Amino acid sequence: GKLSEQLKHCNGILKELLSKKHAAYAWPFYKPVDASALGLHDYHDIIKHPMDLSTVKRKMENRDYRDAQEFAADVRLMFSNCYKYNPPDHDVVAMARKLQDVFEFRYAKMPD
Numbered sequence: 001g002k003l004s005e006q007l008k009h010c011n012g013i014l015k016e017l018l019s020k021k022h023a024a025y026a027w028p029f030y031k032p033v034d035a036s037a038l039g040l041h042d043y044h045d046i047i048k049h050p051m052d053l054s055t056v057k058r059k060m061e062n063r064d065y066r067d068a069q070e071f072a073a074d075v076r077l078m079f080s081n082c083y084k085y086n087p088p089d090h091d092v093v094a095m096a097r098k099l100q101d102v103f104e105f106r107y108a109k110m111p112d
């Protein structure tokens with residue numbers, strides 16, 4: 001389905017976040033947190049709105065996002081979930097900060 005200019009910029013960012021370029025730090029955000037598999041039995045008590053890049057991709061493919069702000073809200077929800085659940089010295093927080101730096105700097109170049 002035909003995306004607005006801003007949603008094409010969003011789709012471009014999404015492809016970059018999923019690309020081999022960022023795989024060393026992006027991989028924990030590829031798929032929903034499998035709380036049971038990881039032994040994180042408190043995850044769904046602490047995180048009320050799980051989010052990950054596969055869900056963002058499905059919503060982009062389904063034309064769920066009506067504007068760039070709605071897309072950005074889900075990407076930032078994903079990072080916020082990471083910062084809320086994890087102690088700030090866990091490697092996954094370092095990885096979140098690096099992927100969010102990629103996101104924020106390219107999101108800022110949104111066409112007007």
Ligand SMILES: CNC(=O)c1cc(C(=O)NC2CC2)cc([C@@H](C)c2ccccc2)n1
Nearest residue numbers: 028029033038082085086087090091092095
């Ligand atoms: C989005 N993923 C997560 O929040 C997450 C959390 C935790 C975790 O055990 N956290 C406990 C609270 C301290 C572990 C992991 C895994 C996938 C992992 C391992 C090593 C490096 C990067 C990731 N991801």
